[PDB]
Each structure stands twice: as structure tokens, then as C-alpha cells.
Short mmCIF file of C-alpha atoms and ligand atoms in Angstrom, two decimals:
data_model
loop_
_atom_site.label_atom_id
_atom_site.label_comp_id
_atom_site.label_asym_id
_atom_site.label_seq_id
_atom_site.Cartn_x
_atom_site.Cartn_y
_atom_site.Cartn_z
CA UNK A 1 -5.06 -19.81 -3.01
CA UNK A 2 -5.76 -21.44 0.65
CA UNK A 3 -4.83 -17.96 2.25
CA UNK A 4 -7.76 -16.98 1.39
CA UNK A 5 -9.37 -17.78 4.72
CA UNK A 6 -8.29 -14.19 5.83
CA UNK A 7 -9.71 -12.19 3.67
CA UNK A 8 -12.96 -11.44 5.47
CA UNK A 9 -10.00 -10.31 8.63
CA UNK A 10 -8.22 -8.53 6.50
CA UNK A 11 -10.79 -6.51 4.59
CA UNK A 12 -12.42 -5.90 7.87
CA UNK A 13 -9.50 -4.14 9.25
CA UNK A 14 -8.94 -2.52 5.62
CA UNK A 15 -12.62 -1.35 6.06
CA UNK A 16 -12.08 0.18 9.72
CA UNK A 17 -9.01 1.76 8.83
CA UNK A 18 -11.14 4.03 6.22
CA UNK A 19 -13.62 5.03 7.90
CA UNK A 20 -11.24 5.86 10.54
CA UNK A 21 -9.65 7.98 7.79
CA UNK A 22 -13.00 9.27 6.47
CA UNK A 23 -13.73 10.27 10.54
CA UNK A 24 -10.55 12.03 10.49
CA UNK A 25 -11.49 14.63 7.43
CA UNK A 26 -9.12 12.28 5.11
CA UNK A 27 -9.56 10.19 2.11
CA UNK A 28 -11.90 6.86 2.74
CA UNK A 29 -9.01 4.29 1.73
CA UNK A 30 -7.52 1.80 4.41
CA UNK A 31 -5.14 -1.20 4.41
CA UNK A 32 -3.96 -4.01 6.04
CA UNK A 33 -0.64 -6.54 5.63
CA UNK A 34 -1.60 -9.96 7.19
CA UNK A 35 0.88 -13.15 7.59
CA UNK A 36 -0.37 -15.85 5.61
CA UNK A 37 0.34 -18.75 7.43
CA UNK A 38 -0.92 -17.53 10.89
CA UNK A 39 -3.26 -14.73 9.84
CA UNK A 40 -1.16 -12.14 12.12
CA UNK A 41 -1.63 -8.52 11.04
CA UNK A 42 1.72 -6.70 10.67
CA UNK A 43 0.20 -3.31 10.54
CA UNK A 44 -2.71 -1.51 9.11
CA UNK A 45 -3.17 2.65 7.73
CA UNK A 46 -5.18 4.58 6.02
CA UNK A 47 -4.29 6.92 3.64
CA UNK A 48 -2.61 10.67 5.11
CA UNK A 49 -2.95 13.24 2.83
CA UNK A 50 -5.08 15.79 4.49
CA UNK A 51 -3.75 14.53 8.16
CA UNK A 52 -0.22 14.36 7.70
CA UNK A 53 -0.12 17.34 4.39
CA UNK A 54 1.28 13.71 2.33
CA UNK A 55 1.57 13.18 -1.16
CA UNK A 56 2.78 9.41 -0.83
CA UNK A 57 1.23 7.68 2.30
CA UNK A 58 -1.60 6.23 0.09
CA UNK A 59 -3.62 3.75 2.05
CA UNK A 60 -1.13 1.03 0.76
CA UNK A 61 1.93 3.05 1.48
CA UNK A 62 0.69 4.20 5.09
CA UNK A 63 -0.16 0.24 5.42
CA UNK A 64 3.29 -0.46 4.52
CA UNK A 65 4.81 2.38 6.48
CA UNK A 66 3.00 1.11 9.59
CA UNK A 67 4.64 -2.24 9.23
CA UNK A 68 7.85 -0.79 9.57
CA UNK A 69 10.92 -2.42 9.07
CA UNK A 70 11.06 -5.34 7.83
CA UNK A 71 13.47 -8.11 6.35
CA UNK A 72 12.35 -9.07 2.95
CA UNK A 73 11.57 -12.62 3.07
CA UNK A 74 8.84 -11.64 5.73
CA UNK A 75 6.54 -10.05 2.89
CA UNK A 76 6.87 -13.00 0.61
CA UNK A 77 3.84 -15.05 2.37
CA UNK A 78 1.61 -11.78 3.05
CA UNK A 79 -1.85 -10.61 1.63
CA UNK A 80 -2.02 -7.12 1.15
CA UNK A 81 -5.48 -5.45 1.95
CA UNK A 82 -6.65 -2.63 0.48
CA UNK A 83 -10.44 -1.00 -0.14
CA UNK A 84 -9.93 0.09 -3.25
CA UNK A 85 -8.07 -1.07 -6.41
CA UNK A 86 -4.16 0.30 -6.06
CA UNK A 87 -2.74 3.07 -8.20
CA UNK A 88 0.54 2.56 -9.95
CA UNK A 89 2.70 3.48 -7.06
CA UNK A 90 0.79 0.89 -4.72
CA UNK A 91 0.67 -1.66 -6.76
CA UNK A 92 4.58 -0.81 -7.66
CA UNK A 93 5.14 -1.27 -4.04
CA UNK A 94 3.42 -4.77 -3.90
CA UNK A 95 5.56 -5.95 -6.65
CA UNK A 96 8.80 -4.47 -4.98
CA UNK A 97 8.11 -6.28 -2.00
CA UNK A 98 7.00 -9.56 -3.67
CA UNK A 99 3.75 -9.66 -1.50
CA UNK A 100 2.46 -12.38 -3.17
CA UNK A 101 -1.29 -11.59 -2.80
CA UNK A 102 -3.55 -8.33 -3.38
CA UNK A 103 -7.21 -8.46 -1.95
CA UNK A 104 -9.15 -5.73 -3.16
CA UNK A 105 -12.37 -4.08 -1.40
CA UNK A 106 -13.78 -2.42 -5.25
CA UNK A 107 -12.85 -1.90 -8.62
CA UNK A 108 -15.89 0.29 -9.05
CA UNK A 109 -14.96 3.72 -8.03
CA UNK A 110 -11.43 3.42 -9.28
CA UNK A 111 -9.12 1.41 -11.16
CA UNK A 112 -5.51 1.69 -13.01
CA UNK A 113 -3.67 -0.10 -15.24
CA UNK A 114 -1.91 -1.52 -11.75
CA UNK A 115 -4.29 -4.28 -10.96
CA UNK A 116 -3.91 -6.29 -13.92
CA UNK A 117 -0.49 -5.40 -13.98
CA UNK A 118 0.02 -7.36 -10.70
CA UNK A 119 -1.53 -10.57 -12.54
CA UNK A 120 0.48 -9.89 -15.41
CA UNK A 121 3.20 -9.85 -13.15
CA UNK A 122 2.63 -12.94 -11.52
CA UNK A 123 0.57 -11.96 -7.98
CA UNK A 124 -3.18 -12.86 -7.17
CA UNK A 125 -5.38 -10.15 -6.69
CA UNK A 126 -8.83 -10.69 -5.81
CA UNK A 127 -11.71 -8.46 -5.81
CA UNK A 128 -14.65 -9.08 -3.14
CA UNK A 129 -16.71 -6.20 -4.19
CA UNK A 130 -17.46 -4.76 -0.78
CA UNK A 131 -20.33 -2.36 -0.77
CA UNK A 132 -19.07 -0.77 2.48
CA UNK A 133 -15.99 0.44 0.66
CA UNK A 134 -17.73 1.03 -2.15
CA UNK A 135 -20.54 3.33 -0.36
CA UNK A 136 -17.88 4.98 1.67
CA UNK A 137 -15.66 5.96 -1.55
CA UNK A 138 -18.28 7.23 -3.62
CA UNK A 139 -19.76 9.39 -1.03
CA UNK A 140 -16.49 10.57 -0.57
CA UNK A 141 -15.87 10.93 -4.21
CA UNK A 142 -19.18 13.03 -4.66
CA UNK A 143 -18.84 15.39 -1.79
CA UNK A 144 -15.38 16.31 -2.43
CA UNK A 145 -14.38 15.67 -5.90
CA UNK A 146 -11.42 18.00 -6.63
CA UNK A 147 -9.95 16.35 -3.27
CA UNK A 148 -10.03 13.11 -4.39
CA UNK A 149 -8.61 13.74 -7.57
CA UNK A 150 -5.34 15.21 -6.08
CA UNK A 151 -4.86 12.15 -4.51
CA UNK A 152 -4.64 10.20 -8.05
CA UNK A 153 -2.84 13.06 -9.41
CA UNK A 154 -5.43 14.53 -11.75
CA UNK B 1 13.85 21.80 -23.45
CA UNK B 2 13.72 20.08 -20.32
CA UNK B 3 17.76 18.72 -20.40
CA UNK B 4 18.79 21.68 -20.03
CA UNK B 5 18.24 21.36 -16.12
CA UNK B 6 19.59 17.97 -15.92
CA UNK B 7 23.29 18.89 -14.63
CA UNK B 8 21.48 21.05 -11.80
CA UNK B 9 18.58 18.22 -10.97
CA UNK B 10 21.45 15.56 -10.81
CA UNK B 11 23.94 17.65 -8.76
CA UNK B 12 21.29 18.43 -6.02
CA UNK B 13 20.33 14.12 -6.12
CA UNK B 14 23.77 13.51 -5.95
CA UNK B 15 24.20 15.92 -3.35
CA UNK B 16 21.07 14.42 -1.23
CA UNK B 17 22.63 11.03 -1.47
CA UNK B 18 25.82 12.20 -0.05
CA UNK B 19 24.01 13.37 2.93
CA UNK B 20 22.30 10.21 3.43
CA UNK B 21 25.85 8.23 3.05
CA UNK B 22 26.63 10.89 5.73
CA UNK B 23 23.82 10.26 8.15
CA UNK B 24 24.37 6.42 8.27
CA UNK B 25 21.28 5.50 5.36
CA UNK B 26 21.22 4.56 2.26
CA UNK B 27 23.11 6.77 -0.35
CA UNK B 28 20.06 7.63 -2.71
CA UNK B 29 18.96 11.04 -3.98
CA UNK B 30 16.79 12.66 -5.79
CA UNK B 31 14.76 16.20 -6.55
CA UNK B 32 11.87 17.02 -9.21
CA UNK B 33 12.31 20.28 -10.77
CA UNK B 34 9.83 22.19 -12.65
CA UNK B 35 10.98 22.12 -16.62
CA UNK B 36 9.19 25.35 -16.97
CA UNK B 37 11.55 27.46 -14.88
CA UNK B 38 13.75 25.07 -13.54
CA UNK B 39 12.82 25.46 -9.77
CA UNK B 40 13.57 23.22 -6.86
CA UNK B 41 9.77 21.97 -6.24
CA UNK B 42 11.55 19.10 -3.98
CA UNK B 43 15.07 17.03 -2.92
CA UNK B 44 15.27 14.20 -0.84
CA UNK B 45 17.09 10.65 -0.01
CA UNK B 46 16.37 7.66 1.30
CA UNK B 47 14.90 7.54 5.19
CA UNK B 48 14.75 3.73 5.79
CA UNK B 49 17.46 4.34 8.57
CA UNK B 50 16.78 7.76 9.38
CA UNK B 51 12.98 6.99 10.03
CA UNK B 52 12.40 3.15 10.12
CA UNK B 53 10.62 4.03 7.37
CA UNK B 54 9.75 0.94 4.87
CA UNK B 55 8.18 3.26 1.67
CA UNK B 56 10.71 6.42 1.78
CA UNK B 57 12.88 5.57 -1.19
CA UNK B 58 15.02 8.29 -2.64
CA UNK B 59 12.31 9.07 -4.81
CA UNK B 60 9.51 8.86 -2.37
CA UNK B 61 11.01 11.05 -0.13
CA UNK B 62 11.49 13.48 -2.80
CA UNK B 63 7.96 13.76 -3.65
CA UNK B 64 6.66 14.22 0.37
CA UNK B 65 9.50 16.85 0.25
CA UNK B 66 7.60 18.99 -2.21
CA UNK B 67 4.34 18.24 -0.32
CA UNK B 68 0.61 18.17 -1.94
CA UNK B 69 0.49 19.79 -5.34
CA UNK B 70 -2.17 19.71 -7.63
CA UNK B 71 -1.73 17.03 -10.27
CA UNK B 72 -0.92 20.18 -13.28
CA UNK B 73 2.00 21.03 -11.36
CA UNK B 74 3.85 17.21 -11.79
CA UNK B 75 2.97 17.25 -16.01
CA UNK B 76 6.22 19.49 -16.45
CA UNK B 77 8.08 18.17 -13.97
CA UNK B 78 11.59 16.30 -14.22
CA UNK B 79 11.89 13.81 -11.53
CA UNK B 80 15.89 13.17 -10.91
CA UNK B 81 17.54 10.16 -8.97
CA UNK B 82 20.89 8.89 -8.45
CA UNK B 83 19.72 5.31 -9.10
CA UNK B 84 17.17 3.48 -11.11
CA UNK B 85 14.17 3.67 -9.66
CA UNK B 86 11.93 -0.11 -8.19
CA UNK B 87 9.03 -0.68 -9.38
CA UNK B 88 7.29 1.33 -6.36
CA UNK B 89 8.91 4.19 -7.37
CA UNK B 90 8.62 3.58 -11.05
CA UNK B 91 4.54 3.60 -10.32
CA UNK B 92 4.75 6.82 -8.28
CA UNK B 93 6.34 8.47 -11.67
CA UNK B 94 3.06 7.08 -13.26
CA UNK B 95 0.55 7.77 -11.06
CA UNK B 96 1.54 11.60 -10.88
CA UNK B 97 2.29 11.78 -14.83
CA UNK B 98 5.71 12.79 -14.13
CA UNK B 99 7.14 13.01 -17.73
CA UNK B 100 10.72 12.30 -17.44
CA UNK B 101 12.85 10.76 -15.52
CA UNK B 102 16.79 11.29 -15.70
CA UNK B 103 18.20 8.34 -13.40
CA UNK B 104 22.01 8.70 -12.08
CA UNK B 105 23.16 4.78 -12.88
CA UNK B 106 21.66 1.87 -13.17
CA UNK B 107 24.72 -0.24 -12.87
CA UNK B 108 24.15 -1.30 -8.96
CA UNK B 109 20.78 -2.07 -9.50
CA UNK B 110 17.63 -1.71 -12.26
CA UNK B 111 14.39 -3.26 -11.95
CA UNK B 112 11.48 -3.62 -14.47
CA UNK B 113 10.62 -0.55 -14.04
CA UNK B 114 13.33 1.23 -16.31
CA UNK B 115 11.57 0.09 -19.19
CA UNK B 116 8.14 -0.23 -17.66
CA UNK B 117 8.10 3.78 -17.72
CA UNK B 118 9.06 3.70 -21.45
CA UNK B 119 6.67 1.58 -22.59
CA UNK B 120 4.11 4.05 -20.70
CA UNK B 121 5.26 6.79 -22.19
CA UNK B 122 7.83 8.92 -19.92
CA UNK B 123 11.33 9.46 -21.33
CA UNK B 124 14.51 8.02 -19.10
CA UNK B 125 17.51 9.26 -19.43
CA UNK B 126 20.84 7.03 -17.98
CA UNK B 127 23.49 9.24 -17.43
CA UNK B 128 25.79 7.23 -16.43
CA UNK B 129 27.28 9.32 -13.28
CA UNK B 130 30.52 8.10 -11.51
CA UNK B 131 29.95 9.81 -8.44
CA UNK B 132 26.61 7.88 -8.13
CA UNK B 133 28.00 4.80 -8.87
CA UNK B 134 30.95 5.19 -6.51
CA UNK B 135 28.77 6.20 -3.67
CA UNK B 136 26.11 3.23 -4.05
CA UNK B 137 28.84 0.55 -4.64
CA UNK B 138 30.71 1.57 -1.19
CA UNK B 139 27.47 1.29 0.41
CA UNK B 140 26.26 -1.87 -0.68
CA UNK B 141 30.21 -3.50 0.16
CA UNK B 142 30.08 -1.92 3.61
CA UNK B 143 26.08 -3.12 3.98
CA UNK B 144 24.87 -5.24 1.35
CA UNK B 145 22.13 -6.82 3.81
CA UNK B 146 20.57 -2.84 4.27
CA UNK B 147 20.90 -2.50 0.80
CA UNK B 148 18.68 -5.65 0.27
CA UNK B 149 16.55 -4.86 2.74
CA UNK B 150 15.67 -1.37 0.87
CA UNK B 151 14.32 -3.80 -2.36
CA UNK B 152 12.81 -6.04 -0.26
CA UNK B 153 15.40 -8.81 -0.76
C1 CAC C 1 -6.45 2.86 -4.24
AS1 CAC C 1 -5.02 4.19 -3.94
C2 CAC C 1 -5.62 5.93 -4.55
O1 CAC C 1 -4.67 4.24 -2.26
O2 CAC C 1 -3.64 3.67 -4.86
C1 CAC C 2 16.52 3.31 -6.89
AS1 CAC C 2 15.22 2.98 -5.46
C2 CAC C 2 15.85 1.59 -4.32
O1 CAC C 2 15.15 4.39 -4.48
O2 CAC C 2 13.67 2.65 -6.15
NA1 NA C 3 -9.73 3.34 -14.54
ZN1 ZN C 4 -1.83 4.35 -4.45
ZN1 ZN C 5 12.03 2.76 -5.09
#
């Protein structure tokens, strides 16, 4: 619902955080974790795979990782931001967490089973369809194909 | 085939738990071995305390420990941890196609997830360890609130 009013904030620094990853030789997928009820970002990544040699810091993860430490009741009124639709282990880490909300830059270039899975388990995810992500992915996606599909574990 | 390595995946998890107890973190453990010839790709435990780290679960930290692969490599893998894995690390099991999962206890703790990898397809066996269970029940009397913390609680 009503936090809603950051999503343009959040996907903005979701947005940035890519194409700071996509500047850096990496994969094109960025994040954010914003407090709901004063729109205060906690921390923001991008994914680390070709910077860091990582096989978990996912966009998400490195979003969450950034954070740091937390207690648990602080992720209960967060949106999660992320430019592309999360894999299993993101959206696993949502749902661990009990962020309540998922705001998603595209669904085009990829989707799992995750995102409904985080309705079905009883978190909003929206999808804005941003063209920047979706632009930023694909070229991505095209250029360097086998690279991307290490990072979904194909 | 695969069970054959389980006593050797779960003695090197239980043994990377121990050495978390040891360094002051959270007693989890795990290591993914490769069915076909039963090597070591990875171990690791838990680095929330060792790190600040908010994503390195047991499991987690296992799989950065074997560092990129390509995706083939994971389809014959066994993924081993002392504990039933959260739903975070549940999906990472997933999104690599890791086909089996042998899980120390789940007596301290199981999420949705147990069955959640079942109903996807990848096998979990419970083996019920006593050293695992020993080892996470001290923990979570000495520290309860770091042991919440790790599941977001
Ligand atoms: C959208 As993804 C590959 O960071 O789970
Ligand atoms: C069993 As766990 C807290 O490492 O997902
Ligand atoms: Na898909
Ligand atoms: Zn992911
Ligand atoms: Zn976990």
C-alpha cells in the first residue's frame, strides 16, 4: 500500500546502483532497502560476481549485505528494491527477513518461480516496468550471454 | 549413489560449525561435495559475527567458499548443513539446481523451506545428528537473541 510513495527513490537508487555495476565490468542488477515510514535508505548494492569472484552477492544479497546488521523487527516495515525480478535465493531472503514489500524494476528479461511465490507467500511485489533497467539488462544479456547465465546458474 | 558421501559431507559441516561455536558465531556448517567423485568443492559456517555479515548463513558461506562455477558443476552436487536450511538458503539450493540436500537436524529450527525443496524436486535427507543438535541448542541458551537475529526474528 501507502509506502508506495518511495518507489520512484527507491528504484532510482536500484537503477544507479546497476549501472554502477554495469561501469564496473559486472552484472547490470542493483538494489536498495528503504524504511517505510520515513523513506530512509538502509543500504544499497549491486550485484559482485565478476568484482568480488561471488557466487551469492546477487544484487539483493549485496543490498542486504550492505545493510549490515540488523535486528529483525527493523526489516518488517522495509521495501526492497531491486531492477530485476529476484531469483529463488533473493526472493528466499525477502521472505526470511519478512520485508514486507518487493518493488521490481522488470519482469521482462528474467523471471522465476520467486516472484509469485512472494505473493503466494503473503508480500506485495510490484512491478513498474522500467525501461532503463530493462535496456541496461538486455544489452547486458546480449553482449555477454554465457556470463549472465552463470549468474542464474544455467 | 550420492549417500554414500553423506557421513564425510556431514562430518566436515559438523566440523565447520564447531569452528564457528569456537570463534564466538553462530554454530552452523556446511560443505557441497561433488556426488561424482566425492570432492570437497566447498565448507563453510555462518559469518554474521565474524563479518557483520547479514546474508552469510552456513549455507551461503559454503557456496562463496567454492567460488564461481559454472551452473553443470552444482547438478551433481550434495549440499550438506548441520541445520535446516531458511527460506534464503532453501532458494539458493534452487536457484543453482543443487539436487540434494542432507540437513544435520531440524529440531532447533525448520522453516518452509524443508518441504518447499521437496515439492520442487530436490531430495532432503534429516539425519537426525546429536552432535548438531547439541551444538545449536548450547548456542541458542547461551544467545538466543543472536540466534534470532540470524532468522531475522
Ligand atoms: C534478479 As537476481 C539474478 O539478482 O536474483
Ligand atoms: C539453517 As540457516 C539459519 O543457516 O538457513
Ligand atoms: Na522465467
Ligand atoms: Zn538472486
Ligand atoms: Zn539460511
Amino acid at each position: 500500500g501507502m509506502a508506495s510513495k518511495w518507489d520512484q527513490k527507491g528504484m532510482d537508487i536500484a537503477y544507479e546502483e546497476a549501472a554502477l555495476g554495469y561501469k564496473e565490468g559486472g552484472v547490470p542488477i542493483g538494489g536498495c532497502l528503504i524504511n517505510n515510514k520515513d523513506g530512509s535508505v538502509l543500504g544499497r548494492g549491486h550485484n559482485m560476481r565478476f568484482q568480488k569472484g561471488s557466487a551469492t552477492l546477487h544484487g539483493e544479497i549485496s543490498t542486504l549485505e550492505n545493510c549490515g546488521r540488523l535486528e529483525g523487527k527493523v526489516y518488517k516495515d522495509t521495501t526492497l528494491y531491486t531492477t530485476l525480478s529476484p531469483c529463488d535465493m533473493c526472493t528466499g531472503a525477502i521472505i526470511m527477513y519478512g520485508i514486507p514489500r518487493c518493488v521490481v524494476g522488470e519482469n521482462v528479461n528474467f523471471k522465476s518461480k520467486g516472484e509469485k511465490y512472494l505473493q503466494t507467500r503473503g508480500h506485495e511485489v510490484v512491478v513498474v516496468d522500467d525501461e532503463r533497467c530493462k535496456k541496461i539488462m538486455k544489452q547486458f544479456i546480449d553482449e555477454r550471454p554465457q556470463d549472465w547465465f552463470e549468474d542464474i546458474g544455467e
